[PDB]
Amino acid sequence: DRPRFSFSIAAREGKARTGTIEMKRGVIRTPAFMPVGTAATVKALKPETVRATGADIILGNTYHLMLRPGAERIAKLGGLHSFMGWDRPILTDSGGYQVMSLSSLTKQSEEGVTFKSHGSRHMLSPERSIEIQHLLGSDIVMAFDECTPYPATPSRAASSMERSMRWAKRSRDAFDSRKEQAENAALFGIQQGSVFENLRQQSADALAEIGFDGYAVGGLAVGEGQDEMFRVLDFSVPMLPDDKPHYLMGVGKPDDIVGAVERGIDMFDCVLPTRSGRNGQAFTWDGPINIRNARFSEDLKPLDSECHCAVCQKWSRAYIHHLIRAGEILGAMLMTEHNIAFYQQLMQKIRDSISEGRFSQFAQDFRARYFA
Amino acid sequence: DRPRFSFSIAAREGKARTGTIEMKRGVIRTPAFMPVGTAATVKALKPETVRATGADIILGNTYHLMLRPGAERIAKLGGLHSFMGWDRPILTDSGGYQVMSLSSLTKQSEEGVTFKSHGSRHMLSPERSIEIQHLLGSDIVMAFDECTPYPATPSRAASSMERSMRWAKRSRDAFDSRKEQAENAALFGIQQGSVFENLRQQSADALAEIGFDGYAVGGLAVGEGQDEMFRVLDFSVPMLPDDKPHYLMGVGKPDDIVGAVERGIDMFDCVLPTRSGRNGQAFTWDGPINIRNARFSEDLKPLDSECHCAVCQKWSRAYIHHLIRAGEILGAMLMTEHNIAFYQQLMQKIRDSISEGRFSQFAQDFRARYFA
Ligand SMILES: CC1(C)O[C@H]2[C@@H](O1)[C@@]1(COC(C)(C)O1)O[C@@H]2CNc1nc2cc3nc(N)[nH]c(=O)c3cc2[nH]1
Ligand SMILES: CC1(C)O[C@H]2[C@@H](O1)[C@@]1(COC(C)(C)O1)O[C@@H]2CNc1nc2cc3nc(N)[nH]c(=O)c3cc2[nH]1
Ligand SMILES: [Cl-]
Ligand SMILES: [Cl-]
Ligand SMILES: [Zn+2]
Ligand SMILES: [Zn+2]
């Protein structure tokens, strides 16, 4: 039987790594892309379809599930895995992004954050966030943090990061004090510090002193743009323990993922393939296309000329164009399945190229064609 | 290889019949339920899922496809079957329902009907309707008629029926004058006459004199209610040729279908399982339920306790309740798959019970439990 948590690096090229995380509910191949399932569903896909595209793990969200259908309710129903019909690992974000994005609904203190609906109130704290993730039965539990807004002054970034590090210790202690959770799930810490190298170093040092199963780079994908994100990754990822997974939260476009892997990231999640798929954007090896465009109305080619997904084996651009134009649910289903399959094929090509020592060439070839 | 069209009755009980229609693209087991796919999609289902529920044939619509994506466009793309990925028989309605339901958008004459969008204009006539159905590649072509509004005076019902019979002859001649269509598709006539026995008889006589591969009972499911619909079926179905299929257009609820089979109907179509499924209504052998109701929020049972569909094998009422409440696409997908599977299981039970000479008992047992 598999351990609670083991991360093993099978091959490396520069800062890039490929390997596996073994957990009780399955193996995660890294670098990994996690489809987002915030409402206890990866939108428009059955779990079996999510798995068929190649996903090893999906992302849920403490904040959204706390509100609907409720954490205690999901626990009474047997946990999130049973509830939604996904039996493989699930990583749950802690709510720390919503601490920032919904801050106008919040009262924040050193104890935690209370959200007021625009009228019910719901509280999150390190202890309550970890508890909710336990009630959900999450396999990878994220520490409760604050995603620092961008831009941030050095003073405010420092104050925010310092609070997040205090909350990281409280998250660690809450997780460890629940024996069933500590024995069966993993806990990841989240590095903060905005774009400032000294603050990123202080945050990494604090997280490593506490000790976690994996380390997320938080506080990015907040409007900073790719050049700046890459600059921060350049110095921030080497600060994290080498022998544990590195998770870049909320990233991203295909070229973001490639460059982040070149900088040592092992795990990703993003709403882009699902959300923009429903909005008519399809990813291809020649760049994204908007299937709504009139130029596709009689195009019999599949969405992408090489993609192995079931959508590209059967249906034309012309048909999917019609469905999306018409607002048909099947349009959302087909676009989403293709985009998630595309993302998984990207991750597979990344893993294979690192394994074979040709990832740098893959990255250059990928960019040359994607941006042609 | 299968013929263009053969209908064979394998067993009978009273007025009820069970058998098969053989066509080039497949066999249709009767009594048959046709899922509705008006926009070149059975809403929220891949064609493979439609087939997995047991459907042998689906319904398309000349009027809707004429407008979007266009009949000539579908022909240029290889036909409706290729376009949507359903390779089995498709029956297309002719537009005659929209002649009535959208009459405020129309100018009608003996030549046909012109529809004006609320600003483009689109014309339908016996000749153009048959041509569109050819361009779509429809397997069962419906004559172009007018669904008489309900209620109708005897005079207006007679005038409407008489025009429909003239249009039925024009439909027959247009179909026969297109060799590829005449050799590979079938043509059904549509009986009109509102609720009036003498007009229904005149219409049946006119259609039988022209000669069709099958005969629809038109002009029902227009607000008349079940008692009146059954009264009209009582005298109308025996007027149609016994050795050809009898198709009741737009019907209906499960108990409508059972009673219509008891009166000699072989084919049905209805938006109820798809549309009301998206709106949260699930069919069960104990009657319909509204999954949105708070009583289902923690109900771990499947939608129906006996249903063999994939939805009832995996997911709980509680999960589907959450999805529909949340407006999630997967909620529409799961409700729709279950409801279509339920309808197909109903048809299978009807076919088996007629084959075994116990359909009258099935109908009584079905009603006693469904309405308990
Ligand atoms: C609202 C929605 C769906 O969230 C997405 C997406 O839009 C959007 C809008 O701007 C883009 C960049 C395009 O991505 O930003 C979100 C993705 N960025 C992101 N997610 C994160 C999650 C995080 N969780 C925690 N606990 N802590 C963090 O520091 C953290 C940082 C993160 N950064
Ligand atoms: C607008 C929408 C989706 O069409 C459905 C459904 O709502 C709704 C609204 O009242 C109920 C009864 C509940 O069923 O009425 C429609 C189903 N009745 C029906 N469909 C027909 C199609 C027909 N086609 C032709 N060519 N000729 C006919 O005489 C004809 C008669 C029909 N009767
Ligand atoms: Cl999404
Ligand atoms: Cl529908
Ligand atoms: Zn594809
Ligand atoms: Zn079912």
Side-chain angles (χ1 to χ4, degrees), chain A residues 2-23 25-106 108-115 117 119-120 122-155 157-178 181-208 210-294 296-372, chain B residues 2-23 25-106 108-115 117 119-120 122-155 157-178 181-208 210-294 296-372:
Chain A
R2 286 181 293 269
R4 177 193 70 86
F5 186 88
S6 180
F7 177 52
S8 180
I9 297 168
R12 316 189 67 146
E13 181 175 340
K15 294 179 169 179
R17 310 103 69 77
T18 189
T20 53
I21 303 167
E22 298 199 349
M23 305 194 66
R25 289 187 165 101
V27 179
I28 301 153
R29 298 165 288 177
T30 70
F33 182 76
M34 298 181 285
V36 174
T38 300
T41 166
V42 179
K43 296 191 192 304
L45 300 182
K46 287 177 176 180
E48 63 198 76
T49 310
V50 179
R51 175 57 183 174
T53 70
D56 294 326
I57 172 168
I58 62 171
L59 179 140
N61 186 289
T62 292
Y63 172 85
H64 297 84
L65 294 174
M66 168 182 70
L67 294 186
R68 187 170 65 184
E72 278 77 8
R73 175 164 289 165
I74 283 169
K76 289 179 188 183
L77 297 173
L80 179 58
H81 291 88
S82 177
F83 184 62
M84 71 182 291
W86 173 268
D87 69 10
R88 276 174 189 276
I90 297 173
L91 182 150
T92 47
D93 200 1
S94 59
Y97 185 82
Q98 287 68 42
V99 172
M100 183 273 299
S101 67
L102 308 179
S103 64
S104 70
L105 306 181
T106 69
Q108 184 187 139
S109 77
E110 184 66 23
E111 290 308 309
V113 181
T114 293
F115 297 84
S117 171
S120 57
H122 291 79
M123 181 274 295
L124 282 179
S125 63
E127 296 76 22
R128 176 59 177 162
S129 176
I130 300 300
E131 182 189 29
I132 289 165
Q133 297 180 71
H134 168 68
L135 291 167
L136 298 174
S138 165
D139 304 281
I140 303 179
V141 176
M142 299 305 302
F144 185 70
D145 64 329
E146 168 178 64
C147 181
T148 307
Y150 177 85
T153 67
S155 169
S159 296
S160 173
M161 178 275 291
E162 288 157 9
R163 174 165 287 172
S164 288
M165 300 303 93
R166 295 187 297 266
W167 286 359
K169 171 62 169 159
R170 283 165 62 188
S171 296
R172 174 87 262 179
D173 292 344
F175 179 97
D176 291 337
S177 290
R178 190 172 285 104
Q181 185 172 38
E183 290 168 19
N184 294 284
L187 183 68
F188 281 24
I190 308 174
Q191 184 200 43
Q192 299 287 342
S194 180
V195 304
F196 305 110
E197 181 169 17
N198 68 321
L199 303 184
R200 287 279 172 183
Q201 182 69 68
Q202 295 169 13
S203 182
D205 290 344
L207 295 174
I210 296 161
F212 292 91
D213 296 308
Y215 298 83
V217 178
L220 296 176
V222 286
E224 76 280 4
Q226 190 192 78
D227 292 348
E228 181 78 340
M229 187 182 73
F230 283 176
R231 183 186 73 82
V232 175
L233 289 177
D234 286 337
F235 57 70
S236 295
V237 186
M239 301 171 175
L240 305 178
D242 184 75
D243 70 342
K244 297 301 180 59
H246 306 151
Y247 167 27
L248 182 55
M249 309 193 71
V251 172
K253 297 171 282 139
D255 48 305
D256 294 333
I257 290 174
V258 171
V261 171
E262 290 177 293
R263 292 163 174 83
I265 297 297
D266 308 302
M267 299 171 70
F268 298 92
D269 77 274
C270 195
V271 302
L272 195 62
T274 40
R275 185 167 71 173
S276 82
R278 301 193 304 278
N279 292 322
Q281 177 168 251
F283 292 93
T284 88
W285 297 109
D286 304 289
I289 60 174
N290 192 325
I291 203 62
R292 293 174 194 269
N293 192 287
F296 300 116
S297 67
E298 299 184 353
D299 189 341
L300 286 169
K301 296 189 297 300
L303 290 174
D304 176 271
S305 66
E306 301 175 8
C307 177
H308 301 97
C309 87
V311 183
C312 292
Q313 297 334 285
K314 184 164 174 180
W315 297 278
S316 64
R317 286 164 172 196
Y319 181 60
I320 299 168
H321 166 93
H322 159 69
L323 294 174
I324 294 288
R325 283 263 182 147
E328 282 292 338
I329 290 166
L330 183 62
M333 292 164 56
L334 297 182
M335 289 290 296
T336 296
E337 175 173 359
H338 163 79
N339 279 351
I340 291 291
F342 181 90
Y343 265 64
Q344 295 300 335
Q345 287 166 93
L346 174 65
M347 304 318 296
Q348 187 62 57
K349 289 175 183 292
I350 291 171
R351 294 191 294 263
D352 291 346
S353 66
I354 299 163
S355 298
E356 295 178 9
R358 55 178 181 81
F359 173 58
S360 184
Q361 190 64 51
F362 169 75
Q364 297 176 29
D365 295 342
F366 165 79
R367 285 190 279 263
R369 180 175 174 189
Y370 195 81
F371 296 114
Chain B
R2 286 181 293 269
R4 177 193 70 86
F5 186 88
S6 180
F7 177 52
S8 180
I9 297 168
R12 316 189 67 146
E13 181 175 340
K15 294 179 169 179
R17 310 103 69 77
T18 189
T20 53
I21 303 167
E22 298 199 349
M23 305 194 66
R25 289 187 165 101
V27 179
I28 301 153
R29 298 165 288 177
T30 70
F33 182 76
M34 298 181 285
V36 174
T38 300
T41 166
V42 179
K43 296 191 192 304
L45 300 182
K46 287 177 176 180
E48 63 198 76
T49 310
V50 179
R51 175 57 183 174
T53 70
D56 294 326
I57 172 168
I58 62 171
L59 179 140
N61 186 289
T62 292
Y63 172 85
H64 297 84
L65 294 174
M66 168 182 70
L67 294 186
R68 187 170 65 184
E72 278 77 8
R73 175 164 289 165
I74 283 169
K76 289 179 188 183
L77 297 173
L80 179 58
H81 291 88
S82 177
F83 184 62
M84 71 182 291
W86 173 268
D87 69 10
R88 276 174 189 276
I90 297 173
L91 182 150
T92 47
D93 200 1
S94 59
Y97 185 82
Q98 287 68 42
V99 172
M100 183 273 299
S101 67
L102 308 179
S103 64
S104 70
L105 306 181
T106 69
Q108 184 187 139
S109 77
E110 184 66 23
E111 290 308 309
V113 181
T114 293
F115 297 84
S117 171
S120 57
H122 291 79
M123 181 274 295
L124 282 179
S125 63
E127 296 76 22
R128 176 59 177 162
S129 176
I130 300 300
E131 182 189 29
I132 289 165
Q133 297 180 71
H134 168 68
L135 291 167
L136 298 174
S138 165
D139 304 281
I140 303 179
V141 176
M142 299 305 302
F144 185 70
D145 64 329
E146 168 178 64
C147 181
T148 307
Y150 177 85
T153 67
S155 169
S159 296
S160 173
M161 178 275 291
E162 288 157 9
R163 174 165 287 172
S164 288
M165 300 303 93
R166 295 187 297 266
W167 286 359
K169 171 62 169 159
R170 283 165 62 188
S171 296
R172 174 87 262 179
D173 292 344
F175 179 97
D176 291 337
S177 290
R178 190 172 285 104
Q181 185 172 38
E183 290 168 19
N184 294 284
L187 183 68
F188 281 24
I190 308 174
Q191 184 200 43
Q192 299 287 342
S194 180
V195 304
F196 305 110
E197 181 169 17
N198 68 321
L199 303 184
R200 287 279 172 183
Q201 182 69 68
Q202 295 169 14
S203 182
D205 290 344
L207 295 174
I210 296 161
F212 292 91
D213 296 308
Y215 298 83
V217 178
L220 296 176
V222 286
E224 76 280 4
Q226 190 192 78
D227 292 348
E228 181 78 340
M229 187 182 73
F230 283 176
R231 183 186 73 82
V232 175
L233 289 177
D234 286 337
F235 57 70
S236 295
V237 186
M239 301 171 175
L240 305 178
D242 184 75
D243 70 342
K244 297 301 180 59
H246 306 151
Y247 167 27
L248 182 55
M249 309 193 71
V251 172
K253 297 171 282 139
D255 48 305
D256 294 333
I257 290 174
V258 171
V261 171
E262 290 177 293
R263 292 163 174 83
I265 297 297
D266 308 302
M267 299 171 70
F268 298 92
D269 77 274
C270 195
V271 302
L272 195 62
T274 40
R275 185 167 71 173
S276 82
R278 301 193 304 278
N279 292 322
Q281 177 168 251
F283 292 93
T284 88
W285 297 109
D286 304 289
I289 60 174
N290 192 325
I291 203 62
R292 293 174 194 269
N293 192 287
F296 300 116
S297 67
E298 299 184 353
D299 189 341
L300 286 169
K301 296 189 297 300
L303 290 174
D304 176 271
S305 66
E306 301 175 8
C307 177
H308 301 97
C309 87
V311 183
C312 292
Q313 297 334 285
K314 184 164 174 180
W315 297 278
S316 64
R317 286 164 172 196
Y319 181 60
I320 299 168
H321 166 93
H322 159 69
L323 294 174
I324 294 288
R325 283 263 182 147
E328 282 292 338
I329 290 166
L330 183 62
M333 292 164 56
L334 297 182
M335 289 290 296
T336 296
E337 175 173 359
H338 163 79
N339 279 351
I340 291 291
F342 181 90
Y343 265 64
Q344 295 300 335
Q345 287 166 93
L346 174 65
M347 304 318 296
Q348 187 62 57
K349 289 175 183 292
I350 291 171
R351 294 191 294 263
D352 291 346
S353 66
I354 299 163
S355 298
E356 295 178 9
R358 55 178 181 81
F359 173 58
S360 184
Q361 190 64 51
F362 169 75
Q364 297 176 29
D365 295 342
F366 165 79
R367 285 190 279 263
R369 180 175 174 189
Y370 195 81
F371 296 114

